[PDB]
Each structure stands twice: as C-alpha cells, then as structure tokens.
C-alpha cells in the first residue's frame, strides 16, 4: 500500500530544518550591513535585542 512506505512528517522535518538552518547563517556571513542615518542624523541600528 502506497501508505505502508509513505513517510511521516515528524522525521522528514528534522532533516529539512537542518540544512535550512545553515543556508541562513552561512548566507548571512557573506553579507554586509549598510548604515542608514535615517533622515535625522540618528543611525538605523541592525539588532533585535535592546535588553535595558
């Protein structure tokens, strides 16, 4: 039965995320960061954690 050898997602996931997790860090390692002194004199900073 075409369901007796049909995979289950729980496990295909664990292989899919793996690679993806890389082509995102690595690809983010071959990228520069262009500062945009947002029309003010300020500075559009490029983070995601101001822990005050």
């Amino acid at each position: 039965s075409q369901a007796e050898s049909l995979p289950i997602v729980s496990n295909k996931k664990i292989v899919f995320d793996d690679e993806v997790s890389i082509e995102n860090k690595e690809s983010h390692k071959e990228l520069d960061l262009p500062e945009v002194k947002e029309d003010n004199g300020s500075e559009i900073v490029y983070e995601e954690n101001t822990s005050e």
Binding site: G41, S42, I44, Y46, E47, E52
Partner: protein
Amino acid sequence: YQRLRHMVNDKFQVRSTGPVNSLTMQPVKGRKRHGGIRVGEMERDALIGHGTSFLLQ
C-alpha cells in the same frame, strides 16, 4: 588621608541625536555610543501627576 580609586561613573553622556534601533526607532542604551537616557515607568507617572500632557508628549 586616602585617595579612593575612580570608583565613579562620572561619565555624563549627552544625547543630541545618534544610534537608534531597527525595530523601535527609539535610541538604545550606550554611554560610550551616545545612548539616550531612559524615561522609565516611574517618571511616566511623575509627569502625569502634575498634569503636563505635553511634557509627556
């Protein structure tokens, strides 16, 4: 007498304008990167009290 080590911040830090943040626009902490001073939840009230809707603004 004894001279106490520079155990002081002293380092004022002003903020005409400089570094902000991508997700909020509000300037972030710093002191050495000209970080804006925090208007925390306490001072929020203070102003509220007096009745200065503008200073708040």
